[PDB]
């Protein structure tokens, strides 16, 4: 059901917090990614849709110091740039 292939920085990200494989569903990459953040306490404690990726792997792949979960389209766009679909 089209499985996707993370590119090397996102696969590294995914592996770091458990993941075992090279190919995934979108669901799966989204659960592992959400896991990575919450796990890396990259989220802002008072307005927790904000995420910081300065001096982190996450900014290496997204190219920005921070971002807002609300920005659904912008965030999907960045994830896809990191997948062969």
């Amino acid at each position: 059901e089209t499985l996707v292939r993370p590119k090397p920085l996102l696969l590294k990200l995914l592996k770091s917090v458990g993941a075992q494989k090279d190919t995934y569903t979108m669901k799966e990459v989204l659960f592992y990614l959400g896991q990575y953040i919450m796990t890396k306490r990259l989220y802002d404690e008072k307005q927790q849709h904000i995420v910081y990726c300065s001096n982190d792997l996450l900014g290496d792949l997204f190219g920005v110091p921070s971002f807002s979960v609300k920005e659904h389209r912008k965030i999907y766009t960045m994830i896809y740039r990191n997948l062969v679909v």
Partner: peptide, 12 residues
């Protein structure tokens, strides 16, 4: 609103 839910809004 939790990060959890905002991200659960992002998927869904």
């Amino acid at each position: 609103t939790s990060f959890a839910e905002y991200w659960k809004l992002l998927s869904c």
